[PDB]
Subunit: 251 residues, 4 copies
């Protein structure tokens, strides 16, 4: 089995690939532009990935990896919320895509297998063309139109503790968010045939955009991030030990 | 920091403390009685804990542990569902408590700090005296009347993958359940001041009971279990 | 796969099985008796094991566990060194054995499979009947006469950081010691067919004895201990 | 605390930075050139590092990382030839380009201490160079010079697996290296104090470097069959060694 994992409580540019307005300051990862006075900027786009590629599966052996990631984000608006942040698995060379409601990871709301991108979004602005009525968490598979969503009551300026996992045995992708301050929690799950939607190797990280209008803005700060992946030697899949993963990585 | 952790995909009596009708068979942990033909039995009560005590906090240093546990259960009814299964943190010497709707871990629905027990229940039968309308997941703190619950649609005979965690920094206890077969998931969270509700050392494990009537029965099988704890200095 | 692991930087009696003069004080594990003034005592014997049994192998599946342990000991003599400390894998019910040069884990220097005990010793006193000329580290398999040893220059009163591992793939048991203060290190390795020398379940821990004479004494303090085991399917 | 770790039982180019003749084939990492017929080549040099930099310490907080690595190598020399030159596990500056070949193992330029080299390595030297080497084949700790600050004799078992384990404990500042040839049940260990914050930069790349002899008959192969690495950087000055019991079973065993 092959394993790769990391856990950061403090950020520094060397281990990350930064794109767009993504910057590291005061130990935290700021995905979108922010004026010196502290207020967000419109039309911003930022991405950040771990500098080492992760192998999601192996065509020759037929093995599929199980993985998990957890991070803490803080979204603040002075002003209306827009556009959101996504955790994404993109092709290794990958360059940013459309901004605004496309969150920098997609080009359209029509399924396009060739986009080879899967993401879990925390959408703060409903786009009439493809979005559910309110702020939501969604699973995007090669299109900005989530294959599943759940309502989310964003607590402005308060920490959000997210946990995403993929179990190769059940092919189930599960995402959950918790706002400790309000004792509120959300969860969502859907089956995803990963070997068909992504390449063998991918970069893992975040993508975030602000609104395209003067008053549709918010900040996207990642305060901590952990990731762990396990690729077996044969077809037989083996979920990860989360009890052990969080305490040794998150708690 | 002190750490203790384990992960079982196969069960064997040696590493566990079995109470009541709790038994290990064919590699799985069966908390409640089951007739040879495979059908559950009424008035059953079973408990099982890891043989090594876990230190939840330290009075002298003021440190509080963060921990997590995950397991897979399978609940089946031929009949009506009753009574449920709970993941519990009990005092080390601890003997079973009332059966039926008390799930073997409590004696009343009135808060009693001296019970020194905290549990996360998967309640399959609504007891008029203290339960919400339907089947639910709840956090119990020294009383069978959950301080918080969430509706749960139990998928009969299908695996349930549960994950419970306690974060000492936020004092937040979070429980989640997933039925992979139906792609359904539930989550619940509530702040718990653990150092006030439990002793420094506890045993961790499960407790399960069946209904007290002829037709209120179900099975409680644990197929795998992991636990991890970290106590700072 | 089944996994069990723990790591202590601070000790407390609840999670351990203490035998003989083994005691926990000021957060450390003291295996042998010590007078209030701080000086060791002769004819002492102490043992301590983790309260949860560990499965070394499985007869039905034919799987053998790989494991590792690491700890820090401090041995001090006011006086001549005796008798030593051992890391041992004993049968679960196991009661102490002969003291003195037998380190509390064996009864003779003649191989006796029925002893079902394997130990890695840090022998501070050469017993003419079975010991190499000086202080040594040795691997004992069902007898106090090590099947392999290595010379060891004990640094009185200075910490010793030990690491022992068992690789089921190669059947190799490897032990190593490091005295950071003197920048000295020792290593030893030998093949051991574990499934033949021990039972499926064992208790893991330490055993230590002092000399049987008035001036053959030393202290045996364990300052930290970690253990990890993995049993495949 | 910041943590980074990985463990490979099978190799693939994407996650590694390959330099020189370093190549990945049949799942293993081949550091030095090898003719199709299987025999090694002279004057070869190969290096390979994990694609993500590792932070060894932090100047602002004064924290120093504790880390460990373990790997399995197989060194082989054809009957008619002689062993040369060796393989090293190294911690080099991030941009770092290969250095002198032959007995310099691709990581150093001289046997005179040069702090500006900012490189620390643990070598498995198969050829004694009169100018700075002990009499026989050895394991040594090199700190900014090819002349080890400490060595230990090593009886290389030709063609047999070598299981190496290297660790650095920030609390004691002790670097410890060990090798085991399971086939022969032989083992070696070496240890020495190293003030890492003074010999290396805050960020480094971790990996291997290997060279073959500069003569027609001084050649050997350098194959890495598996590799694990784990690092932990605290938030303050206070150092905390790693849990090796847990590290090997979860990574090596
Ligand atoms: N990703 C996830 N988030 C929350 N609970 C889970 N249970 C299993 N996977 C989970
Ligand atoms: N116990 C838990 N279950 C699901 N998601 C979580 N996120 C944090 N703790 C969690
Ligand atoms: N037990 C052990 N001690 C020291 N080095 C080792 N390398 C492999 N096993 C070892
Ligand atoms: N690097 C190392 N190799 C072998 N034994 C060790 N004990 C502590 N560190 C070690
Ligand atoms: Ca949107
Ligand atoms: Ca009930
Ligand atoms: Ca002796
Ligand atoms: Ca040389
Ligand atoms: Mn959306
Ligand atoms: Mn209830
Ligand atoms: Mn001896
Ligand atoms: Mn040399």
């Amino acid at each position: 089995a092959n394993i790769q994992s990391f856990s950061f409580k403090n950020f520094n540019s060397p281990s990350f690939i930064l794109q767009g307005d993504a910057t590291v300051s005061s130990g935290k990862l700021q995905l979108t532009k922010v004026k010196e006075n502290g207020i967000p900027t419109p039309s911003s786009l930022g991405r950040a990935f771990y500098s080492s590629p992760i192998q999601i599966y192996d065509k020759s052996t037929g093995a599929v990896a199980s993985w998990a990631t957890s991070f803490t984000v803080k979204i603040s608006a002075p002003a209306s919320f827009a556009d959101g942040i996504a955790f994404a698995l993109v092709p290794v060379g990958s360059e940013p895509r459309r901004n605004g409601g496309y969150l920098g990871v997609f080009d359209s709301d029509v399924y396009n297998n060739s986009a080879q991108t899967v993401a879990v979004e925390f959408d703060t602005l409903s786009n009439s063309g493809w979005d559910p009525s309110m702020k939501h968490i969604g699973i995007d598979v090669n299109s900005i139109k989530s294959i599943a969503t759940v309502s989310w009551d964003l607590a402005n300026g308060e920490n959000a503790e997210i946990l995403i996992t993929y179990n190769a045995a059940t092919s189930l992708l599960v995402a959950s968010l918790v706002h400790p301050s309000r004792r509120t929690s959300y969860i969502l799950s859907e089956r995803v045939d990963i070997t068909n939607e992504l390449p063998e190797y991918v970069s893992v990280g975040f993508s975030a955009t602000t609104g395209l209008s003067e008053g549709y803005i918010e900040t996207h700060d990642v305060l901590s991030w952990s990731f762990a992946s396990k690729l077996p030697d044969d077809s037989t899949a083996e979920p990860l030990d989360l009890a052990s993963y969080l305490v040794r990585n998150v708690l």
